[PDB]
RNA sequence: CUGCCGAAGUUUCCGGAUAGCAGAAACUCAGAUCAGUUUUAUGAGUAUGUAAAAUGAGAGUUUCUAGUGGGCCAUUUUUGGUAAGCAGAACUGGCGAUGCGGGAUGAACCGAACGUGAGGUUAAGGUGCCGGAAUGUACGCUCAUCAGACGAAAAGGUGUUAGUUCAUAUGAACUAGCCCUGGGCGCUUAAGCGUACUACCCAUACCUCACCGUCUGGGUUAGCUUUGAGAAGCUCAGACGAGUAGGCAGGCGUGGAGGUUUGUGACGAAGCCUUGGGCGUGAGCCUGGGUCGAACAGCCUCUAGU
RNA sequence: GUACGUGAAAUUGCUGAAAGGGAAGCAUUGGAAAUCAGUCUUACCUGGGUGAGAUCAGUAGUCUCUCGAGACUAUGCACUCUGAACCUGUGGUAGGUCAGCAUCAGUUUUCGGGGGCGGAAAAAGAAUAAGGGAAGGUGGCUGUUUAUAGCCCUUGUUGUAAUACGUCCACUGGGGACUGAGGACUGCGGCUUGCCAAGGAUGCUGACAUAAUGGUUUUCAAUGGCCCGUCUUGAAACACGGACCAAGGAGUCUAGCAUCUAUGCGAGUGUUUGGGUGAUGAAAACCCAUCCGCGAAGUGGGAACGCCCUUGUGGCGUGCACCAUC
């Protein structure tokens, strides 16, 4: 889960394939759910959060 | 973000060790401990579109 | 900045080498049962937009300049500001009286001429 | 922005940007120092060593 | 000439009016709905339909308007068959509009569906030589004096291999496998067959990058010394790329006309020739040299015996 | 040179070069030979000397615009300027193709080293204090039981063993290949204003350039490559058309109708049957008298807007087009 997100991680930002090269990309698209960084995205995926 | 990342890594280590300790206790006591099924599944497509 | 050409061979019309009546200029094969249209193996290539060259280096000569056709001295003076992007090309119908005056003018302007030594000799 | 994608698992500088926690990780931590008690009762061994 | 969309090949009534398929326009919506989806449960009879959880995608229209309005093969289902085959329907997709790797070769088989390329990695199939890749490893089976390799076929075998079982070290009855009888060169403790495990080969497939185009989403004016306002420009980002009928867009070329280039030309127009050079994905265009001898062209628009 | 402007293609003769076992044949990649583009250092910077002259004068006039802006004229060449000519500089700095290396970035491939954890907290095993047993039996003698060899099982045993395997390290050391897109600065980070492997390649060198790099033609080698169009047909099979080249050669004009777009005006709209007029072509353009043709004949949702005010959220109103309700 960690290596796939770090090397092949690409967000769907406004119907576009935007790589997760910055935490502000994930925060701008998943900040509504208290997800702010890439390790928070990994944590949600790995532990299957709410 | 750094504090959140440290907490996640601490949670992973504790969750892995407790699984090991539970299995060790069941093995010593002679009982059988079945780990919980996983909620996360990584699916890869192997056949083409034809 | 180097000019990259995706292809240098021209696209010849199919079966243009078997008949003199069929010219080399590319014609799209309309035959349905034609192997060239269906793009089999060993069949020739066809003009596709994929072969299109880089926009930045399009129309550029191998020396990095774009050709500008010149018919008189007034045309060559337009390239005062664009002498590092364009090369003067004197037209084929411009006489030798004007070819010499274009070449001398293009020399002071710092403009390359692609055919500057045409229809003239030298006298040192 | 982002002309070229850099892998955090190879570029340490990009990893430090993405994860402000790699500077203090301590990947290898000694757990079993000097105890290592063999935990396998005779009941488990008999069931395992069967047939 | 290029680019972008792109079917259907058939329900239904009956040559048709429909519809379906594919586009155009105007509408209302993403806090709305939808699905060759999977469930849950209600019932009803392992399935079934209905109603209400997961997953994915913003959805629903209205109007009018091109083409199709054959089948083949294959799968499954099938009813009777009936020398045996088969025939008959139905069910479902693929091809028909479609190239590519393998399959000796081949249109139905195995992979895979296509912009132009560099590198990497694979699929199917392969690695003795033709042929890219182990004359690889570990077990066995097979001797053919037609193997194998890619119906007389059932069986017989003083034919084997492993043998089992039962009788008292042997014999009988048996249990199967293989042989005998009934693509090329070549291979035989295989380069055959079966199993297991490493390595290796390469497709237009997959990944990373560059470039082309299209589509989509943005940004850009008290036009700031970043000057990049042909705003019809400039710029940023992502995805995508087969294609018949047909739909749509932008371009190339020809004769003549209005305007324009204060245009070219006897110091050589037009034309033609050329293993001269260049530009464009292409239609095409520019140019050197030779030949030649009087006219001719670029740009905006108009026109057609183009 | 009357076989007469230009003189294409098919076709023919000669000459030269190359190739050639029962086709040619084209494509892809290179070689060879022939033949081309295809280019160069030459300028910048900084002087000093010398003289030169105006856009320079502690200068005088004229002309055209409008004081001062251009054009000149006379004089000076002192002040400024002219990278201004030359002498003196021997000062500096030096672009195109092809190569080598280094430091990097993206991608990738291939060898290692170290460590954590898990597995019966590996199984074994050694060491090892014992007990028991039998063997395919040592000694004694096939049978036999540690001897004059040992083995197996069990506990014990050092122990918290080691190793293998699995998994993990934001642990680390090399080798190879392919790419370098973008073009002031912005950002996210790491170090300590600065620095950096952090929103995409730069350094250090050479040689050749005056050949290399390429390109073209011919030809060879390797690999591939069934004849085009039409009709047929799932598909092909087919059957047709094709000796070769040049020129000609097929959705045109017009009347009506309907959709759509553009343009003009708009309850209107349309000058060209005709009349007026038009001296520079007068079949144009321009003007319009009377007709006539065609047209005319309340409640909900909602675009858009204002006001708020817990401010976003929502609410309060005004509600086009259009669709539902009376």
From Swiss-Prot, chain B:
Any single biological process term in GO: cytoplasmic translation
Keyword Thylakoid: no
Keyword terms of this UniProt record: Cytoplasm, Nucleus, Ribonucleoprotein, Ribosomal protein
Entry's Gene Ontology cellular component terms: cytoplasm; cytosolic large ribosomal subunit; nucleolus; preribosome
Residue stretches spanning the membrane: none
Main location: cytoplasm
The keyword Translocase belongs to this UniProt entry's keyword annotation: no
An MF annotation (GO) of this entry: RNA binding
Compartment(s): Cytoplasm; Nucleus, Nucleolus
Quaternary context: Component of the large ribosomal subunit (LSU). Mature yeast ribosomes consist of a small (40S) and a large (60S) subunit. The 40S small subunit contains 1 molecule of ribosomal RNA (18S rRNA) and at least 33 different proteins. The large 60S subunit contains 3 rRNA molecules (25S, 5.8S and 5S rRNA) and at least 46 different proteins.
Family recorded in the similarity comment: Belongs to the universal ribosomal protein uL30 family.
Function: Component of the ribosome, a large ribonucleoprotein complex responsible for the synthesis of proteins in the cell. The small ribosomal subunit (SSU) binds messenger RNAs (mRNAs) and translates the encoded message by selecting cognate aminoacyl-transfer RNA (tRNA) molecules. The large subunit (LSU) contains the ribosomal catalytic site termed the peptidyl transferase center (PTC), which catalyzes the formation of peptide bonds, thereby polymerizing the amino acids delivered by tRNAs into a polypeptide chain.
More info: There are 3 genes for uL30 in S.pombe.
Full protein name: Large ribosomal subunit protein uL30B
The species this protein was found in: Schizosaccharomyces pombe (strain 972 / ATCC 24843) (Fission yeast)
Lineage: Eukaryota, Fungi, Dikarya, Ascomycota, Taphrinomycotina
UniProtKB/Swiss-Prot annotation, chain C:
SMART domains recorded: Ribosomal_L32e
GO biological process, one term: cytoplasmic translation
InterPro entries reported for this sequence: Ribosomal_eL32 (IPR001515), Ribosomal_eL32_CS (IPR018263), Ribosomal_eL32_sf (IPR036351)
One GO MF term: structural constituent of ribosome
Keyword Ribonucleoprotein included in the entry's annotation: yes
Residues with PTM Phosphoserine: 74
Domain of life: Eukaryota
Main location as per UniProt: cytoplasm
Cytoplasm in keyword set: yes
Keywords: Cytoplasm, Nucleus, Phosphoprotein, Ribonucleoprotein, Ribosomal protein
Family: Belongs to the eukaryotic ribosomal protein eL32 family.
Note: There are 2 genes for eL32 in S.pombe.
Function: Component of the ribosome, a large ribonucleoprotein complex responsible for the synthesis of proteins in the cell. The small ribosomal subunit (SSU) binds messenger RNAs (mRNAs) and translates the encoded message by selecting cognate aminoacyl-transfer RNA (tRNA) molecules. The large subunit (LSU) contains the ribosomal catalytic site termed the peptidyl transferase center (PTC), which catalyzes the formation of peptide bonds, thereby polymerizing the amino acids delivered by tRNAs into a polypeptide chain.
Protein name: Large ribosomal subunit protein eL32A
Organism: Schizosaccharomyces pombe (strain 972 / ATCC 24843)
Highest classification ranks of the organism: Eukaryota, Fungi, Dikarya, Ascomycota, Taphrinomycotina
Curated annotation (Swiss-Prot), chain D:
Subcellular location: Cytoplasm
Positions of the UniProt region annotated as C-terminal-extended nuclear localization signal: 1-51
Disulphide connectivity of cysteines: none
Protein family according to the UniProt entry: Belongs to the universal ribosomal protein uL4 family.
Domain note: The eukaryote-specific C-terminal extension harbors a nuclear import signal and delivers the ACL4-uL4/RPL4 complex to the pre-ribosome, triggering uL4 release from ACL4 and incorporation into the 60S ribosomal subunit.
Note: There are 2 genes for uL4 in S.pombe.
Assembly mode: Component of the large ribosomal subunit (LSU). Mature yeast ribosomes consist of a small (40S) and a large (60S) subunit. The 40S small subunit contains 1 molecule of ribosomal RNA (18S rRNA) and at least 33 different proteins. The large 60S subunit contains 3 rRNA molecules (25S, 5.8S and 5S rRNA) and at least 46 different proteins. uL4 is associated with the polypeptide exit tunnel. uL4 interacts with its chaperone ACL4 and the nuclear import receptor KAP104.
Function statement: Component of the ribosome, a large ribonucleoprotein complex responsible for the synthesis of proteins in the cell. The small ribosomal subunit (SSU) binds messenger RNAs (mRNAs) and translates the encoded message by selecting cognate aminoacyl-transfer RNA (tRNA) molecules. The large subunit (LSU) contains the ribosomal catalytic site termed the peptidyl transferase center (PTC), which catalyzes the formation of peptide bonds, thereby polymerizing the amino acids delivered by tRNAs into a polypeptide chain.
Record's protein name: Large ribosomal subunit protein uL4B
Gene name in the database record: rpl401
């Amino acid at each position: 889960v960690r290596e796939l997100i770090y090397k092949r991680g690409f967000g769907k930002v406004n119907k576009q394939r935007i790589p997760l090269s910055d935490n502000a990309i994930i925060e701008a698209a998943l900040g509504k759910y208290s997800i702010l960084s890439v390790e928070d995205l990994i944590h949600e995926i790995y532990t299957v959060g709410p | 973000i750094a504090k959140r990342a440290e907490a996640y890594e601490a949670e992973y280590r504790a969750a892995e060790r407790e699984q090991i300790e539970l299995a060790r206790k069941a093995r010593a006591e002679g009982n059988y401990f079945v780990p919980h099924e996983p909620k996360l599944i990584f699916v890869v497509r192997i056949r083409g579109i034809n | 900045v180097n000019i990259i050409k995706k292809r240098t061979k021209p696209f010849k019309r199919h079966q243009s080498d078997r008949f003199k009546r069929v010219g080399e200029s590319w014609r799209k094969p309309r035959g349905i049962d034609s192997c060239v249209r269906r793009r089999f193996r060993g069949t020739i290539s066809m003009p596709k937009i994929g072969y299109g060259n880089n926009k930045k280096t399009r129309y550029c000569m191998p020396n990095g300049l774009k050709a500008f056709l010149v018919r008189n001295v007034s045309d060559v003076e337009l390239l005062l500001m664009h002498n590092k992007t364009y090369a003067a090309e004197i037209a084929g119908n411009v006489s030798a009286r004007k070819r010499v005056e274009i070449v001398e003018k293009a020399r002071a302007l710092g403009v390359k001429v692609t055919n500057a030594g045409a229809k003239v000799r030298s006298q040192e | 922005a982002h002309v070229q994608k850099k892998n955090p698992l190879k570029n340490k500088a990009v990893l430090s940007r993405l994860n402000p926690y790699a500077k203090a990780y301590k990947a290898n931590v000694k757990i079993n120092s000097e105890k290592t008690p063999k935990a396998a009762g005779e009941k488990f061994l008999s069931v395992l060593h069967e047939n």
